[PDB]
Ligand SMILES: Oc1cccc(O)c1
Ligand SMILES: Oc1cccc(O)c1
Ligand SMILES: Oc1cccc(O)c1
Ligand SMILES: Oc1cccc(O)c1
Ligand SMILES: Oc1cccc(O)c1
């Protein structure tokens with residue numbers, strides 16, 4: 483989860499539809 | 500329909516979960 | 517207020533002219 | 534003005550209180 | 551150049567240091 | 568030196584090309 | 585290129601309007 | 613800790629959305 | 642919750658960029 | 670063609686940077 | 699130049715994200 | 727996580743301050 487630690491492009495991919 | 504006109508905050512509520 | 521305690525959009529309406 | 538002709542930051546200083 | 555046409559992640563890579 | 572204080576526009580000019 | 589640019593403003597607005605509910609976004 | 617300067621930028625964006633054409637009289641940091 | 646609120650604004654902008662045409666599903 | 674609504678959001682961000690704590694009295698779209 | 703000016707604001711935000719720690723060199 | 731978040735505001739400011747000159751950005 484992306485406001486505790488920073489998320490990479492790859493972790494961010496998981497929100498995409 | 501929102502890039503080519505200012506949608507009302509009422510209307511944008513349609514995108515909410 | 518709002519940079520110490522979170523303010524909703526309804527709350528921010530009280531600062532509009 | 535500024536959304537038809539580009540305004541520099543020096544120019545925008547004229548709208549500060 | 552990225553304001554005439556849109557640039558992908560890959561075209562954007564080229565500005566990086 | 569700018570995340571942990573507001574740099575002057577004078578100071579930020581140091582990052583310009 | 586306004587389509588790409590307008591989407592970025594739309595998702596911010598949605599973020600603000602939807603609050604804890606979140607939202608679902610797609611172009612087209 | 614909240615950076616008030618940075619929080620202020622977001623608050624002004626929120627105010628712009630909320631108040632539209634009539635604008636806002638104060639930025640409530 | 643002010644910090645989480647500011648971060649989320651940043652997060653939805655990144656998602657918008659990362660996800661391109663597929664769009665995305667945001668929940669806090 | 671310039672979207673004035675969207676341009677306005679950028680102008681308010683610029684004004685926030687330029688005017689700092691004293692704020693701005695008008696958004697010159 | 700107003701449109702190119704608005705697009706560039708968006709562009710530097712994307713570059714910031716794409717480039718991560720490497721940073722970037724921006725020219726209009 | 728403020729470091730990541732503050733960088734995004736810094737690059738916008740730099741974009742605005744530097745104008746046609748551009749700028750050079752790195753973290754650290
Ligand atoms: O974890 C995060 C939060 C916000 C933006 C981002 O790129 C990553
Ligand atoms: O219809 C819209 C589009 C983009 C931003 C906004 O606040 C409203
Ligand atoms: O309390 C706040 C602070 C910043 C932006 C916002 O929408 C609300
Ligand atoms: O003329 C303009 C319009 C929008 C933002 C800005 O910095 C200048
Ligand atoms: O060509 C562009 C311009 C601005 C943002 C972006 O992601 C791509």
Ligand SMILES: Oc1cccc(O)c1
Nearest residue numbers: 569573574735736739
């Ligand atoms: O020193 C800074 C940092 C971030 C934004 C800004 O306008 C100034």
Ligand SMILES: [Cl-]
Nearest residue numbers: 589675676704
């Ligand atoms: Cl725009």
Ligand SMILES: [Cl-]
Nearest residue numbers: 618619647731
């Ligand atoms: Cl922030």
Ligand SMILES: [Zn+2]
Nearest residue numbers: 589593675704
């Ligand atoms: Zn824009």
Ligand SMILES: [Zn+2]
Nearest residue numbers: 618647731735
């Ligand atoms: Zn921020």
